[PDB]
Design a protein around this ligand. Structure first.
Ligand SMILES: Cc1ccc(Cc2cc(=O)n3c(c2[NH+](C)C)SC[C@H]3C(=O)O)c2ccccc12
Ligand SMILES: Cc1ccc(Cc2cc(=O)n3c(c2[NH+](C)C)SC[C@H]3C(=O)O)c2ccccc12
Ligand code: NA
Ligand code: NA
Ligand code: NA
Lengths: 236, 231
């Protein structure tokens, strides 16, 4: 990702070193009074929250390279009581105090635009998810999740589009944002497997019916086409 | 009820020769079939983002009220972020309509206003996640409670009849006021709301807060001064 690579170089040019995190660590947390801009360079994370119950809610997934901001750029205060949890075995991120992100974007509108554009992708992502859920329910949500996994990690092979992610992490990601390991979601996913939309073979998973995923997640398909046209184009 | 950053953004646009435009109910400030994309500075009024299927069914995706910024195209590429319309649902709305290419020049010469627009995106992002969180906990009751809570915070007025949502009746029906019916009746039948004299009144604000906790937190975090009027 070229635009992201230039942002990494811009961060290091201003003396910002990367930090390494491990699965289950929090890059930022809902209790910290200080808010941050995270430039997630490599790895996979989820945004989580907690209800009074202590129930962990998975709200959103992010992969490197991407920007996640836990506070508003102007007030520097929280956008919500969120944690950013690493779910890949390792992740690399640049962790900047929000007051400094401001200074840096102030001096290079190209990198301002890069971060601005990431927020725009998030906004339209959530609206597309809402639309697909409003049309097709949890099946739209799950097909959308699988569809984005296929486009981001899939590689065409004779056996179909192989998901090139370790099986451990992949099965976590098959679950859409919401409650942890919902049985209703597990049944949806295994039903797609039973119908051979995604199939296990020789220790790997292959999407063999991409059209089915596109059918039930049409608005996330359009979102990805509009948001990441080159990646979309590779498998269409 | 003055939004200082929005007022300063408005001065900034008008001294760069961008003029306000009026729209009436049902007009599309931008539409899903237009290849040209825009930055909308919605200064006054209420709108809804929609998507229209080939089938012709209209999906209501998001509501916006002035003052706010809605961008139909990505700032860098200038291409669509989604096949969306911005439909006016108040009787009139006022908006500044800026071609996406022209916006890039402006936010670049002023960083305070760049940040104002950036922050509106952040408010939309966190809004959607909070909406999702309340629906995951409380399903449709949470969604409806959240919509009523925001309406109460933004438009509510103290009256002997409760907290009156001060929107003319035509706008309320544009907002939705079968399975929704099943919920709204539970709410009247438990005292939470009442419709009187063709007006809408909240009488158990705590109930709404109970079932839309994450949107309540969003509003506390995003609009503290307004939230504080009823907390
Ligand atoms: C399985 C899965 C689904 C969805 C997301 C979220 C996601 C993916 C993605 O590729 N992009 C974005 C998002 N959201 C942040 C909107 S923003 C633009 C684009 C990008 O990363 O450049 C997943 C993310 C990581 C891993 C799996 C995902
Ligand atoms: C009933 C109803 C619900 C939600 C919204 C959306 C909304 C309201 C709001 O007050 N704010 C925002 C939103 N979203 C755009 C995130 S962003 C921060 C704040 C603001 O306007 O400054 C409604 C909007 C208008 C009318 C009714 C709404
Ligand atoms: Na935090
Ligand atoms: Na192609
Ligand atoms: Na358009």
């Amino acid at each position: 990702n070229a635009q992201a690579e230039e942002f990494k170089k811009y961060l290091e040019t201003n003396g910002i070193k990367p930090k390494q995190f491990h699965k289950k660590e929090l890059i930022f947390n809902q209790w910290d009074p200080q808010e941050y801009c995270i430039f997630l360079y490599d790895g996979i994370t989820k945004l989580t929250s907690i209800s009074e119950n202590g129930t962990i809610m998975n709200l959103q997934y992010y992969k490197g390279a991407f920007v996640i901001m836990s506070g508003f750029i102007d007030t520097e205060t929280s956008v919500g009581y969120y944690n950013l949890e690493v779910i890949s075995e390792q992740a690399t991120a640049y962790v900047i105090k929000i007051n400094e992100l401001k200074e840096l974007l102030s001096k290079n509108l190209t990198h301002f635009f890069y971060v601005f554009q990431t927020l725009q992708k998030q906004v339209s992502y959530s609206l597309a998810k809402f639309n697909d859920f409003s049309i097709n329910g949890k099946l739209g949500s799950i097909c959308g999740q699988l569809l984005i996994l296929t486009y981001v990690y899939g590689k065409e092979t004779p056996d179909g589009i192989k998901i090139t992610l370790d099986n451990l992490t992949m099965q976590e990601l098959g679950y859409s944002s919401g409650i942890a390991h919902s049985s209703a979601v597990s049944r949806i996913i295994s039903k797609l497997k039973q119908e051979k939309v995604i199939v296990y073979k020789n220790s790997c998973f292959y999407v063999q019916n991409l059209d089915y995923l596109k059918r039930y997640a049409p608005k996330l398909d359009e979102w990805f086409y509009l948001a990441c046209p080159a990646t979309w184009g590779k498998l269409n």
